[PDB]
Symmetry: C2
Subunit: 100 residues, 2 copies
């Protein structure tokens, strides 16, 4: 009856899996922000703008990619939390099926 | 005893969660490929290379971001599969706890 524990564990994974999905939607938003800036970067090069104009925009793009990478690493860590909960549940079910 | 089903469902989530983690590692590899190309893009602008040189590289960067986005969408769909398995398991445990 104690293996209550599976429900609680499942309550966590479902909320945390939803948190991943939200983080992935943020990640798409950030990737869509690259599409915008890279199309502007093209336009500056098409226009023949200055090295300062292009460099400024390119510095902004580099920052954005670093933010994207940090978000991705956070997502990977959260996935490892979700994997750890999956393993927990598998073991709980294994010990549960060991009963007559 | 049939709720066998939880173990099988958990077998799927654990393998699929590991597939997410692998996909996220690929996603990092692709984001690291942006860091390389954007640093080269800076160098071309620093050198004062031609519009063709920069445009070529920038076209490659745009393709890469589209590949990154498609991978992310695939990951989101796989997460929704994992969420659907989590919900399945929660319902199985709910019907299981409804016994005396």
């Amino acid at each position: 009856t104690e293996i209550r524990e599976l429900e609680r564990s499942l309550r966590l994974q479902l909320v945390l899996a939803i948190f991943l999905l939200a983080l992935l939607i943020v990640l798409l938003w950030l990737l869509q922000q690259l599409k915008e800036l890279l199309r502007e970067l093209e336009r500056l090069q098409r226009e023949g703008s200055s090295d300062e104009d292009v460099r400024e925009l390119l510095r902004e793009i580099k920052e954005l990619v670093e933010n994207i990478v940090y978000l991705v690493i956070i997502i990977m860590v959260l996935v490892l939390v979700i994997i750890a909960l999956a393993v927990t549940q598998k073991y709980l079910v294994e010990e549960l099926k060991r009963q007559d």
